[PDB]
Paper text:
Clathrin mediates vesicular transport between post‐Golgi membranes in eukaryotes and is targeted to specific membranes by interactions with clathrin adaptor proteins. A total of 3 consensus clathrin‐binding peptide sequences have been identified and structural studies show that each binds distinct sites on the clathrin heavy chain N‐terminal domain (NTD). We have solved high‐resolution structures of NTD bound to peptide motifs from the cellular clathrin adaptors β2 adaptin and amphiphysin plus a putative viral clathrin adaptor, hepatitis D virus large antigen (HDAg‐L). Surprisingly, with each peptide we observe simultaneous peptide binding at multiple sites on NTD and viral peptides binding to the same sites as cellular peptides.
The viral peptides (HDAg‐L1pep and HDAg‐L2pep) bound at a similar site on NTD. However, in both cases only 2 consecutive hydrophobic side chains could be observed in the hydrophobic pocket (“IL” and “LL” in the cases of HDAg‐L1pep and HDAg‐L2pep, respectively). Interestingly, for both HDAg‐L1pep and HDAg‐L2pep the residues bound at the clathrin box do not match predictions based on alignments to the CBM consensus sequence, 18: in HDAg‐L1pep residues “ILFPA” occupy the positions corresponding to the LΦxΦ[DE], whereas in HDAg‐L2pep the residues “LLES”, including a C‐terminal serine residue that is non‐native and was added to the peptide to aid solubility, occupy the positions equivalent to the first 4 residues of the LΦxΦ[DE] consensus. The HDAg‐L2pep peptide could also be observed binding at the arrestin site, although the interaction was less extensive. The binding was largely similar to that observed for the cellular CBM peptides: the side chains of the 2 consecutive leucine residues bound at the hydrophobic cleft and their backbone atoms interacted with the side chain of Q192. In addition to binding at the clathrin and arrestin boxes, in 3 of the NTD:peptide co‐crystal structures solved (Amph4T1pep, HDAg‐L1pep and HDAg‐L2pep) a bound peptide could be observed lying across the interface between blades 6 and 7 of the NTD β‐propeller. In the co‐structure with Amph4T1pep a phenylalanine side chain projects deep into this pocket while in the HDAg‐L1pep and HDAg‐L2pep structures the side chains of a leucine residue and proline residue, respectively, bind less deeply. In all structures a hydrophobic side chain (leucine in Amph4T1pep and HDAg‐L2pep, isoleucine in HDAg‐L1pep) covers a surface hydrophobic patch formed by the hydrophobic portion of the R297 side chain and the hydrophobic faces of the peptide bonds between NTD residues 298‐300 on the surface of β‐propeller blade 6, and in all structures the backbone carbonyl oxygen of R297 forms a hydrogen bond with a backbone amide nitrogen of the bound peptide. Despite the similar molecular interactions made between the Royle box and the bound peptides, we note that the direction of the peptide chain differs between HDAg‐L1pep and Amph4T1pep/HDAg‐L2pep.
Numbering used by the authors:
A (entry chain A): 4 to 363
B (entry chain E): 4 to 9
C (entry chain G): 2 to 7
D (entry chain I): 4 to 7
The structure:
Amino acid sequence: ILPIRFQEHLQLQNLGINPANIGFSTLTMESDKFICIREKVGEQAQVVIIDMNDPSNPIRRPISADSAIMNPASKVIALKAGKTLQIFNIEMKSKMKAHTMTDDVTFWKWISLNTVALVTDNAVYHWSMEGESQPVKMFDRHSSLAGCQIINYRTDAKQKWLLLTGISAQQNRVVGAMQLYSVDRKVSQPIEGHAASFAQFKMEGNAEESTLFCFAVRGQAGGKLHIIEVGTPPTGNQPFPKKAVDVFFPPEAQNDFPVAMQISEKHDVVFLITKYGYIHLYDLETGTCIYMNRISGETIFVTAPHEATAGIIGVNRKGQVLSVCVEEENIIPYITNVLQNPDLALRMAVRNNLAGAEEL
Amino acid sequence: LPLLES
Amino acid sequence: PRLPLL
Amino acid sequence: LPLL
């Protein structure tokens, strides 16, 4: 019995998707609702939009964009070509917003239901879709990311802690460089890391939630995962004790590294996916490693939260759309019996209201 | 023109 | 439903 | 100094 439920939702090649377009620069998945793929048919570039609730009927539209990212919740698409940004409501056939930058956007992502983040060579911007807003600069990029491929950007729930992630090759390995920025302190901290996420977590005896920052890295020393509270605790809160644990890589995965993280706040569990398809689950509170296995033989290049199950969903280079979540009726007896860790089993059981710690 | 034709 | 690879 |  496994503490997780693993599924394949779709094979994109069965929808006529050319495997040459299944990759980081042409396939986007900003949430579990849509997958967008940029393709060429003849001379015409097009975007293929797969509604994950009706996947066998994709929508194709002509475009002349170098990047397409769908809103997390609605059929509203952001398109760019060099410095030109345009936002379209698809169903209304209408251009909601347009903006011309003065720098190319090397990476962009929806960070909420109504805000797009833009990364240029020099800085990170936020652009709200409300009213007549234009992009607002959040911070200047730190020199430690100079030359990196930018692979992710994310924030905490209140958008006070911002995290830009890049990778490059140093000494024949893929080295991650992160920039953690505090909006309130206007200070950046460079960190060696590969994949990360924020989470809200309410400690027992604390009246307010803590804001936690979790990151995984394969460093020179080995793989490590860290879970640390950012900011001053809310007034009246105990500080969250920081955690640091090993991230395991088997001998034959000598060039693997972490590429994705999502955190379930329903289960207080961290999902970590490596470049070469390994899945890890960690307890958010203690950092204890719950489970590792391999879910993909092909590299996984994009993930999102899987909202229905509070899991993680992703696409691999073959075009399999795969998800992993906590199997709620197995996770506790797995932890009790296979990990032989009643302490954790009991804690998770009462903390997240899961069955199975009636016998330990 | 428009980056998307609708 | 599916099984991991290891 | 540090954020973390």
